[PDB]
Amino acid sequence: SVSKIEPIADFVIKTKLLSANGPEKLQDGRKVFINVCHSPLVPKPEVDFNARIVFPLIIQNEWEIPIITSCYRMDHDKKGQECYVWDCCINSDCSRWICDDIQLREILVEWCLESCEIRDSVVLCRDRIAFPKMKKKGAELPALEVLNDELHQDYKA
């Protein structure tokens, strides 16, 4: 059974595509946008966010904010050049944690970049990075199709 997660727009990561080694063709050097968004349907860490507890767990690879990433979609800039867009959906509580702790927000941004890199075999720039003041890139964020074992425990069947 496939469930739908309708993400709530939050903020955008702007970057650059350095290389594409995946099953599909992408143009190197094109602008990349990542929509960091949220839903209460995304799993969340079992350990509540407390900086002194959690940052050592992150170093130990024992704690992470779960991310559900969409397939990429194409948009175009004003000169007609292709730009690639991904949605990275996290639990709504985790979206509030990254408001109050800038160190956690930086790590979450890195996790979102790695998530797109993993799912589509792309390499994204860590230097040519920006944070547009918009909530999302593009029109309505499309629904994420997920299996029931991917949902937050309290929202499973």
Residue numbers in the entry: 28 to 184
From the study:
The R2TP complex is found in organisms from yeast to humans, and consists of the AAA+ ATPases Rvb1 and Rvb2 (human: RUVBL1 and RUVBL2), a TPR-containing protein, Tah1 (human: Spagh or RPAP3), and Pih1 (also known as NOP17 and Pih1D1, but referred to as Pih1 henceforth; Kakihara and Houry, 2012; Te et al., 2007). Pih1 is the multipoint scaffold of the R2TP complex, coupling the Rvb1-Rvb2 hetero-dodecamer, the Hsp90 chaperone machinery (via Tah1 in yeast or Spagh/RPAP3 in metazoa), and the TTT (Tel2-Tti1-Tti2) complex implicated in activation and stabilization of PIKKs (Hurov et al., 2010; Kakihara and Houry, 2012). The biological roles ascribed to the R2TP complex are directly associated with its ability to interact with the Hsp90 chaperone system and function as an Hsp90 cochaperone (Boulon et al., 2010; Izumi et al., 2012; Takai et al., 2010). Here we present crystal structures of Hsp90-Tah1-Pih1, Hsp90-Spagh/RPAP3, and Pih1-Tel2 complexes that together define key structural links within the R2TP core in yeast and in animals and reveal how R2TP connects the Hsp90 chaperone system to the TTT complex involved in PIKK activation.
Interaction with Tel2 involves the N-terminal segment of Pih1 (Horejsí et al., 2010), which contains a conserved region of unknown structure (henceforth, PIH domain). We also obtained crystals of an essentially identical region of budding yeast Pih128–184 and determined the structure of this with molecular replacement. The PIH domain consists of a twisted five-stranded β sheet with one face traversed by a helix-turn-helix segment connecting strands 4 and 5, and the other face traversed by a coil segment extending from the end of β strand 5. An additional α helix connecting strands 2 and 3 projects from the end of the sheet and packs against the larger of the other two helices.
